[PDB]
């Protein structure tokens, strides 16, 4: 997996 | 000088695969992040050598439970239902350089919660402690802190506030 930001705009 | 206080680490979680903002782990008492390589060594009469086994990685912690909360209830659901959880460890005082100017240095993990214990004792606020098992390589990056939680909803008294 890569990095994803905390916010819902960057949901998995 | 420039010593690093523990309480500047912010720990965040969210259930994997649902499009929602990450929720902060409030009222941590103590915390630790561990990485450990299970190396063996192989002997031979030409000489022994060390062999590069795989690495196990895990995150661990303790918190105080409170009434305005529903998250420990999610941890204890997650350990039993084997739900995959994303988690961040963010350093609240290292900001990103540019473009990431509003973000803070972080590690991103995903994995499963593997332990949850409630501890309750007469004359005491009951604690819970948990363990989280990281899958694979944790990933470095910069993370947006949920500003509405971290700076807008300030509260008076012994709760930390500016």
């Amino acid at each position: 997996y890569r990095f994803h930001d905390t916010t819902k705009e960057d949901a998995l | 000088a420039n010593m690093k206080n523990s309480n500047d680490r912010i720990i965040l979680f969210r259930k994997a695969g649902e499009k929602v903002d990450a929720t902060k782990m409030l009222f941590l008492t103590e915390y630790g992040l561990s990485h450990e390589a299970d190396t063996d060594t192989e002997d031979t009469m030409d000489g022994s050598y060390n062999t590069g086994g795989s690495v196990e990685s895990t995150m661990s912690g303790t918190a105080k439970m409170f009434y305005g909360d529903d998250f420990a209830d999610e941890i204890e659901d997650a350990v039993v239902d084997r739900v995959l959880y994303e988690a961040w460890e963010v350093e609240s005082r290292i900001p990103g350089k540019n473009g990431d100017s509003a973000k803070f240095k972080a590690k991103y993990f995903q994995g499963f919660h593997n332990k949850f214990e409630l501890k309750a004792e007469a004359n005491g606020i009951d604690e819970y402690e948990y363990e989280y098992g990281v899958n694979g390589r944790f990933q470095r990056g910069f993370a947006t802190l949920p500003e509405a939680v971290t700076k807008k909803l300030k509260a008076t008294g012994y709760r930390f506030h500016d």
Binding site: - | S6, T156, Y158
Partner: protein, 127 residues
């Protein structure tokens, strides 16, 4: 406000409801009929408790003077205080939880009269 003052005010709001006089310290021109309550400003320790809050220890002293003619009534005041101020006090900014309460009584002859002097100490953990 500090927790000290918040607690002190909640203690007055309580004890002043019994109608016997409540004072921090008697002044010379002020006449106080027995029994009466003396109430002394709390101490507070504070230290880091979680990544997100302080905790600490707030110690409240209240102090009941009566003539020794009737002990059962004096003890009735002691019990009435303890039952009002424990187990927990809630106020605007702070919560208080009884960790222990200590009751000590002495027979006081300093004033040419046999008085009963009960000191009540309550230690609240606070959050």
């Amino acid at each position: 406000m500090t927790p000290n003052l918040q607690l002190y005010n909640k203690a007055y709001e309580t004890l002043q409801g019994y109608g016997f006089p409540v004072i921090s310290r008697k002044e010379m021109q002020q006449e106080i009929p027995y029994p009466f309550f003396v109430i002394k400003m709390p101490e507070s320790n504070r230290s880091k408790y979680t990544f997100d809050s302080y905790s600490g220890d707030t110690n409240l002293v209240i102090d009941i003077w009566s003539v020794s003619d009737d002990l059962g009534h004096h003890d009735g005041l002691v019990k009435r205080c303890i039952d009002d101020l424990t187990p927990s006090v809630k106020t605007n900014d702070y919560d208080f939880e009884e960790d222990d309460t200590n009751i000590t009584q002495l027979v006081d002859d300093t004033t040419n009269q046999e008085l009963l002097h009960t000191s009540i100490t309550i230690s609240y953990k606070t959050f």
